[PDB]
């Protein structure tokens, strides 16, 4: 439903050699190509520095998709507004999202969201070049959620992966909530600065 | 155009959150998101380190798409083979290509090709993050042509931008030819090494 609706805002304009999602120009990019960039970045700047670059890239994508969802706001509930995010992420072929428990009220600054991630392109791309890892590896995907939800709520909303396919788990699972409700929220917020 | 022929190799499966072009998984990525990453890489590693990283990412994309083109060899001419490169580059929303002159024989190792680039995503976004540039800026786009053509020929075909919108130019213009037919071809080839 949310997919069908938002999918109509994705258009291919070959006569411009361009692709548009709402107001934003998009490119189709091979995950292998992004994966080899990630490898170079990790290999030369280190896992931590690379994680941040990607999280902030994901952050701007999410902010942009939130602007797009903001225009499509009429008739939609707060949850329906939130749902567009997972939907765009899915349309963009990034990940398949299933909302598990979602508590939102934008007026009241209420947000607590848990989501299932399946077929995370990031997790199964890190795998093909690093194998399994200690910490969660879907950095760009997390930044997108963070970006999208913070833009929607008009306040800092951070996300963490509780489990991730690149750690060896069967799925990625994420939790989003306001900066105040994270035990190390200040360290988390830092990663989103250049 | 044969954009039609290749269009059938692009399959969107939203009900799964994935996009495949031939046998490569793809994502739709906001050019503004790539722009932000590009900005951080320049500021942190310099113009030339970054240019290298993008050329190499583009190179990987090109090599993968030439693999797709090869499965569609059918009863195509060498030029018709060559032509799927520009077609894929246009399907992926990167740029629209116009051949000026194309001289190719894969068997004999001959290649000399000049093209127009219109509506370059990469030139357009570089200007938005840095302004007009001193030298051509469609790094990822050049690497793709290089990678695609080199993989198709089984020999190193390097491309250079003679003109670029990122420079104040009303369009981009490129020249591709074998390594040995460039005077500086050994220092150009260096950028394709991590
Ligand atoms: C809000 C949002 C957007 C995209 C996702 O993958 C997940 C979430 C939670
Ligand atoms: C070969 C090839 C591939 C992609 C382009 O944009 C241009 C050329 C010439
Ligand atoms: Zn993950
Ligand atoms: Zn250019």
Query: Which residues, including other chains, have CB under 8 Å from residue B93's CB and lie 6 or more apart?
Result: A12, A17, A18, A19, A25, A26, A27, A28, B121
Contact B33 A121 (CB under 8 A): no
Residues in chain A closer than 8 A to B33 (CB atoms): 57-58, 60-61, 64
Query: Which residues, including other chains, have CB under 8 Å from residue B100's CB and lie 6 or more apart?
Result: B114, B115, B116, B173
Helix pair angle (B139-153, B78-91), 10° resolution = 150
| Resolution value in angstroms | 2.1
Q: How was this structure determined?
A: X-ray
Rounded-to-integer distance, Cα A182 and Cα A188, Å: 9
Contact B28 A10 (CB under 8 A): yes
Residues A117, A173: contact at Cβ < 8 Å?
A: yes
Residues A146, A139: contact at Cβ < 8 Å?
A: no
> SS3 letters for A99-148?
EEEEEEECCCCEEEEEEEEECCCCHHHHHHHHCCCCCCCCHHHHHHHHHH
The response to whether residue B111 sits with its C-beta less than 6 Å from ligand 2 reads: no
Rounded-to-integer distance, Cα B97 and Cα B105, Å: 20
Mark A28-60 as b/e (b = at least 16 C-beta within 10 Å).
bbbbbbbbbbbbbbbeebebeebbbbbbbbbbb
Q: Which of B93, B99, B125, B141 to mutate to test the interface with A (most CBs of A within 10 A)?
A: B93
Contact A36 B92 (CB under 8 A): no
Residues in chain B closer than 8 A to A14 (CB atoms): 3, 90-91, 96
CA dihedral A78, A106, A158, A152 (to 10 degrees): 70
Residues B96, B118: contact at Cβ < 8 Å?
A: yes
Give the position of tokens 């490119």: A27
Which two tokens mark B44?
A: 């942190």
Q: Would you list the domain boundaries of chain B?
A: 1-194
Phi-psi region of A46 (alpha: psi -120 to 50; beta: other; left: phi over 0): left
Rounded-to-integer distance, Cα A121 and Cα A127, Å: 10
Which two tokens mark B69?
A: 């083109």
**Residue B48: how many CB atoms within 10 A of its CB?**
10
Q: What residues pair up with A13 in beta bridges, in sequence order?
A: A18
- Phi first, then psi, for residue B144 (nearest 5°) are -60, -55
Q: Is A194 exposed, middle or buried (0-12, 13-18, 19+ CB in 10 A)?
A: exposed
Residues A26, B28: contact at Cβ < 8 Å?
A: yes
Mark B119-147 as b/e (b = at least 16 C-beta within 10 Å).
bbbbbbbbbebbeebeebbbbbbbbbbbb
Rounded-to-integer distance, Cα B44 and Cα B67, Å: 34
- Phi first, then psi, for residue A137 (nearest 5°) are -125, 5
Rounded-to-integer distance, Cα B180 and Cα B186, Å: 8
Which two tokens mark B43?
A: 């500021």
Rounded-to-integer distance, Cα A162 and Cα A146, Å: 15
The runs of H, that is alpha helices, within B72-176 are 78-91, 121-130, 139-153
Name all residues whose Cβ lies below 6 A of ligand 1.
A 82, 85-86, 89, 95, 97, 113, 115, 141, 144-145, 148-149, 176
Q: Give, in order, the Cα–Cα distances in Å from B37 to each of A22, A142, B29, B43, B112.
A: 21, 16, 12, 10, 34
Rounded-to-integer distance, Cα B184 and Cα B151, Å: 21
Q: Is A145 exposed, middle or buried (0-12, 13-18, 19+ CB in 10 A)?
A: buried
For A30, the closest chain B residue by CA position comes to B26
Rounded-to-integer distance, Cα A80 and Cα A62, Å: 16
């Amino acid at each position: 439903d949310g997919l069908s609706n938002l999918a109509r805002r994705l258009r291919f304009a070959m006569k411009e050699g361009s692709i548009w999602l709402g107001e934003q120009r998009m490119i189709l990019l091979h995950t292998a190509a992004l994966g080899a960039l990630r490898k170079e970045l990790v290999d030369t700047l280190g896992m931590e520095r690379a994680r941040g670059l990607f999280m902030r890239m994901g952050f701007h994508s999410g902010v942009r998709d939130a602007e797009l969802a903001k225009t499509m706001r009429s008739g939609h509930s707060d949850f329906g507004m939130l749902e567009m995010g997972p939907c765009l992420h899915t349309i963009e072929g990034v990940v398949r999202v299933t909302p598990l428990t979602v508590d939102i009220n934008i007026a009241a600054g209420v947000y607590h969201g848990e989501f299932l991630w399946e077929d995370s392109f990031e997790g199964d791309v890190h795998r093909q070049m690093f194998g399994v890892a200690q910490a969660p590896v879907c950095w760009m995907q997390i930044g997108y959620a963070t970006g999208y939800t913070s833009a929607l709520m008009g306040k800092t909303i951070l996300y963490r992966e509780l489990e991730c396919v690149g750690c060896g788990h069967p799925h990625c699972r994420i939790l989003g909530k306001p900066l105040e409700q994270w035990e190390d929220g200040e360290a988390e917020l830092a990663l989103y600065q250049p």
